[PDB]
Amino acid sequence: MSKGEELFTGVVPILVELDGDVNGHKFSVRGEGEGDATNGKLTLKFICTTGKLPVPWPTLVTTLVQCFSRYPDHMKRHDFFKSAMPEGYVQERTISFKDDGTYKTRAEVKFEGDTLVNRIELKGIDFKEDGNILGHKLEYNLRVSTPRWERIARVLVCLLGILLSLYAFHVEREHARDPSYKALCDVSSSISCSKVFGSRWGRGFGLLGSIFGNDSALNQPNSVYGIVFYAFQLLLGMTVSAMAALILMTTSIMSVVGSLYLGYILYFVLKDLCVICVTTYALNFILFVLNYKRLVYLNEAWKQKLKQDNSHNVYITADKQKNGIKANFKIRHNVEDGSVQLADHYQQNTPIGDGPVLLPDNHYLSTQSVLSKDPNEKRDHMVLLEFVTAAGITHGMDELYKSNSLEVLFQ
């Protein structure tokens, strides 16, 4: 919905010009290419016209034209970028690199004749000389190490596991020893009712006591092992490493064999039902499957490159006070030595001209980037292929995990 949308029905030539100053180092970047909004496709080539580049190319991708994002028909009344055309919009960004410097960018995106032009002024400040940016220690890509659904599922299963472990601990400490607990559980079906809390298997899973002193500090109630195991799986799940994956796999196998043991006790040798126990068994199985999937991906991701997601969501909300939009998102650059460099992106966009612009509901853009080189180009350069598509707004529940209200919580 605008005149501006009608300007993106075919292939549009793209020109990008950037002047930058990072810790005193001045540089110029000129890129050219074409964009296809119907496919949300960007094909661009950038060159550094002032010699070598002082910052890694991946740190400049977000700075170096969201008006080429593919907006589905249903969401077309939420496309601010195209509605501001041909007059264009001003896009300002502050990008905070964790434990490092900061980018301040101001750009004008507008139509000049037939060409969509994006002129950028950038300045970086407070960057470490031996950091990941000025040290050129970032990988030449914008991939996502672990798939997003595995991260979300992992943090959810681990959080629920910690909560159930804490509640089981609370029942063991403040509920299980009262006689009214026994009397009430023999007449009522409650999630707090179980015969394993005040039992032989309540401490150390029954074994590992009389294997240790049976009064030692290593023979704790099972809920303690719960908190420790789920918090451990959470904190080590944050790290993507072969070591971490092996450790998580081993701990998950221990968790599933322990769950089979205590389940066997639950059904046969201590005949009862424990909802908390069964739920934690399901969570241990899910963590097992997630760790196995992380190892399989670690070994076969090179084959599955052709089908990796590698999508980053930029979250857009309306800004009525300035007749524009605001956007926030985080980019996780992979470091060569295995670590991660975080980039916090704060963004605002205001229309240049005086015309009806579309103020959208909260949504997001899914952006996939592919960085490559031109073997014929002798200058410091970057070949970029982008795929951007808007998402976050539907009516049906079958795709509800895709809604913006749920995606914002996991970023």
List residues bridging with 115 in a β-sheet.
112
Q: Identify the domain containing residue 215 by its residue range.
A: 149-302
- What CATH number is attached to the domain comprising 250? 1.20.1440.130
Residue 277 annotated in ligand binding: yes
SS3 content of the chain, % helix, strand, coil (to 5): 35, 30, 35
Contact between 46 and 31 (Cβ < 8 Å):
yes
- Quote the DSSP letter at residue 360: P
Q: Residue 387 is inside which H or E element, if any?
A: strand 381-391
Write out the DSSP string of 322-337: GTEEEEEEEEEEEBTT
List residues bridging with 350 in a β-sheet.
90
Residue 313 annotated in ligand binding: no
Residue 292 annotated in ligand binding: no
Contact between 81 and 163 (Cβ < 8 Å):
no
Name the token pair of 54.
Answer: 């002082």
Buried b (16+ CB within 10 A) or exposed e, 3-16: ebbebbeeebebeb
Q: What is d(CA 49, CA 119) in angstroms, rounded to the nearest whole number? A: 15
Q: What is d(CA 404, CA 386) in angstroms, rounded to the nearest whole number? A: 22
Contact between 81 and 110 (Cβ < 8 Å):
no
Resolution of the determined structure in angstroms stands at: 3.3
Sequence-distant (6+) residues with CB within 8 A of 265 are 196, 201, 206
Q: What is d(CA 66, CA 82) in angstroms, rounded to the nearest whole number? A: 9
DSSP 3-state of 287: helix
List residues bridging with 88 in a β-sheet.
none
